[PDB]
């Protein structure tokens, strides 16, 4: 059994903790912590190590190498927060810096897809995720909509990256 | 204005003075013909090529090509490059 | 003394490796330490998101040789005008014939076999003085004393 | 756009430059300015093909891509009752030391 360290990056209040809480416990509800769950993906039992990033922003040698350990990243934004979509670029810059590679298994995630007033169109996120060469998935931490899809597709990106 | 640089095997290289002035040794020794007692022709011919490469790209604002050096000349050229101070 | 300013003001920059070498971008942090960045293959370009007042220099990725950016050894991004990027062109410098010969010999002889050569002892030392960046930061500060 | 060349005859070699649009005869005036021989008594060769006095250096194969300053192109020279073009080779480099193989 191989382990897959997954990191969840994003802006404040986009549902980074809420996404992990459903993937771990199927139990939708508060600090930077790491969670582990054994799941079967593509008929293959593997261990998931989810680190929900949180707190103030910091670029220390501690925090850099802590993010370096992750094998794949979820870049999460809220569809009703325009800033969270236009912030995705900065998270990808730092991911590519600490991993020291322009090809890192990543996936753009649009959460909070259960609210009526969306301010970020789906076309904007498809044109952005195409420029990064990464998959895009609309999720909802309230209804489990694509919560398995968002996490499982990243594991396929890491298994593809294996050279 | 051209100066004359003679190698150890009688090969004389005619090169402009401002190009030969790159060498700190050649600069001090001149006063129109310069002889070399232990630098062969295949080494002095390459040094004269560096003089052209030097003056041509020393203030170039664009990209500059690499100066090619073959392995069979690299060791002998380093001795000549050391003596000439260029 | 040679350090980046903590401006927190973004500035999009384009790095361009117009050298036949693999270029190593070196960022001078706010404390003056050189921090390397992902390398650039020969003949490539990248849209870097740097910040105003940040110091940059570029070296050969392997041999740590010196390289020029816009015909100078340092790069500070300005402020972008009308959203235009800022182009940093990386070229080879005119290496002295002595230094170029050293680079070629360093790439063909293992450092354990430097002393097995038939060169003079003055050159045996020059071979083992591989370029370090700290001595280059030390001189560059002394060079800008005016 | 300049073209960088080596004018070689016997054990002599001239390192000079010229624009690609300049004439072969114009180059013979430069050779005359070093080697005291008139252009009527000169015969320039690119490899072993006689260069016509009216053509430009580019019309002879000399381009800034094939005639770089760090690797200039060779032009044979014959003086005059003309001689046969004779370029003496340079010295030969020594065998590669075993540490550099
Ligand atoms: C400190 C340096 C990073 C530096 C800097 O950027 N430089 C220095 C040279 O000029 C070049 C430039 C740089 O590196 N370009 C990127 C790059 C990439 C590849 C290549 C290849 N070649 N080159 C040359 C490259 C360059 N620098 N200097 N001044 C500043 C900075 C960084 C930014 C500072 C101010 C930003 C303000 N923010 C606050 C508001 C919200 N925001 C926010 N809110 C919460 C969290 C985060 C966040 N961000 O990342 C992360 C994670 C967790 C994920 C992910 C991996 C890591 S790792 C680590 N430690 C993390 C953390 N905390 C993270 N979470 N973001 C973001 C969007 C803006 C001003
Ligand atoms: N409607 C809706 N609300 C959601 C969803 N996911 C999270 N939220 C809401 O977002 C708020 C904050 O989300 P949270 O999971 O704490 O996000 P976070 O990115 O971990 C915030 P921090 O970075 O500060 O830890 C909560 O009020 C929660 O109810 C979702 O899918 N739909
Ligand atoms: Mg949280």
Numbering used by the authors:
A (entry chain D): 1 to 29, 35 to 168
B (entry chain B): 17 to 46, 57 to 112
C (entry chain C): 62 to 207
D (entry chain A): 1 to 80, 84 to 103, 105
From the publication, what sentences describe this entry?
Two isomers were revealed to be more efficient degraders, with ACBI4 exhibiting the most promising profile in HiBiT-KRASG12R Cal-62 at the 4 h time point. SPR data also confirmed ACBI4 to induce the most stable ternary complex of the two more active diastereoisomers, for both GCP- and GDP-loaded KRAS (KRASG12D-GCP + VCB: t 1/2 = 3,283 s, K d = 0.9 nM; KRASG12R-GCP + VCB: t 1/2 = 1,863 s, K d = 1.6 nM; KRASG12D-GDP + VCB: t 1/2 = 11,699 s, K d = 0.08 nM), with >35-fold improvement over the initial hit 3 for KRAS­(on)G12D and ∼20-fold for KRAS­(on)G12R. The cooperativity value for the formation of both KRASG12D-GCP + VCB and KRASG12R-GCP + VCB ternary complex also substantially improved, with ACBI4 featuring the largest α value (α = 143 and α = 106, respectively) compared to diastereomer 5c and compound 3 (KRASG12D-GCP α = 60 and α = 4.2 and KRASG12R-GCP α = 89 and α = 7.3, respectively). We consequently aimed to determine the stereochemical configuration of ACBI4 and rationalize what was driving cooperativity by solving its ternary complex structure. We crystallized ternary complexes of VCB-PROTAC-KRASG12D-GDP and -KRASG12R-GCP with ACBI4 and solved the cocrystal structures of both at resolutions of 2.19 Å and 2.85 Å, respectively. We observed that the overall binding mode remained the same as previous PROTAC analogues for both KRASG12D-GDP and KRASG12R-GCP bound structures. At these resolutions, the stereoconfiguration of the isopropyl group could not be unequivocally assigned from the map density. Based on extensive knowledge of the stereochemical preference of the alkylic side chain at that same α-carbon in high-affinity VHL ligands , and our ternary structures of compounds 1, 3, and ACBI3, the α-carbonyl stereocenter bearing the isopropyl group has been assigned as the (S)-configuration in our refined structure.
Here, we address this gap through the development of heterobifunctional VHL-based PROTACs capable of engaging and degrading KRAS­(on), thus addressing a wider range of KRAS mutations.
